[PDB]
């Protein structure tokens, strides 16, 4: 069982694994803010961040590396603000879930678009 | 470990007195297992296997035919354990 089983059943309803949005944004025409980044590429390369961990909040990971190098090897003192970095990742994950859920609703709208004609 | 002949004698007579098909009386080291006692051909296999699970080594079939009394049982155990005192 699972959602992939529904991907074997409803391909036009279920989006699938790792889907591109396939839609023009601002379809609801609300005030969607632009995701900006405080840090730039130069200090991102100076902090030796890998290509996988370059999210939209990599500066919290940069501050976590600063607190790691400030107190080493005793790195149990930064833990709470370490949790802060994880919460940013959690917020990013929520947005990903948001997009996926929005995707499903839009394909559901496409289903009644198939009932439009 | 360290063994002596009296410990082997005490162990063999103890586990033979624990056997219920033989009576605790009329049991001696020179007593024959076949005609002096009431054990049949199949109970000798149980006696030999009790010797095996006590002393920790298995006994072959022809050596089981060779042993007929507790005296050569003690001699057979003392041969492998190599006490000889």
């Amino acid at each position: 069982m699972g959602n992939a089983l529904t991907h074997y059943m409803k391909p036009d309803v279920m989006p699938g694994p790792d889907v591109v949005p396939t839609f023009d944004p601002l379809l609801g025409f609300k005030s969607r803010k632009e995701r900006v980044m405080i840090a730039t590429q130069e200090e991102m390369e100076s902090a030796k961040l890998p290509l996988e961990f370059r999210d939209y909040c990599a500066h919290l990971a940069i501050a976590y590396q600063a607190c790691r190098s400030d107190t080493f090897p005793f790195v149990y003192k930064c833990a709470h603000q370490k949790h802060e970095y994880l919460t940013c990742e959690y917020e990013d994950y929520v947005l990903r879930m948001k997009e996926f859920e929005r995707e499903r609703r839009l394909l559901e709208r496409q289903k009644r678009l198939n009932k439009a004609a | 470990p360290p063994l002596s002949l009296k410990l082997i004698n005490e162990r063999v007579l103890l586990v033979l007195k624990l056997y219920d098909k033989i009576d605790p009386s009329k049991l001696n080291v020179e007593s024959h297992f076949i005609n002096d006692l009431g054990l049949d051909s199949l109970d000798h296999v149980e006696v030999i296997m009790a010797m095996e699970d006590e002393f920790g080594f298995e006994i072959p079939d022809s050596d089981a035919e060779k042993l007929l009394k507790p005296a050569d049982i003690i001699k057979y155990v003392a041969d492998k354990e190599d006490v000889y005192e």
Binding site: E42, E43, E45, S46, A47, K48, I62, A63, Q65, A66, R68, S69, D70 | -
Partner: protein, 53 residues
């Protein structure tokens, strides 16, 4: 041996040490930093740039 008898460019058969770039966290000297030796000839010099020839 690893400080003054490294594999120089004049010979083959020393312990040729190649080192990676150290990371720079905030609180270090020159935190906005680009990697140096970005010219192509500066990689794997082994002391050729200081040669008298």
């Amino acid at each position: 041996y690893f400080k003054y008898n490294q594999n120089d460019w004049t010979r083959k058969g020393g312990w040729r040490v190649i080192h990676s770039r150290k990371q720079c966290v905030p609180g270090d000297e020159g935190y906005p930093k680009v990697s140096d030796r970005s010219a192509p000839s500066d990689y794997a010099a082994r002391g050729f740039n200081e040669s008298p020839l």
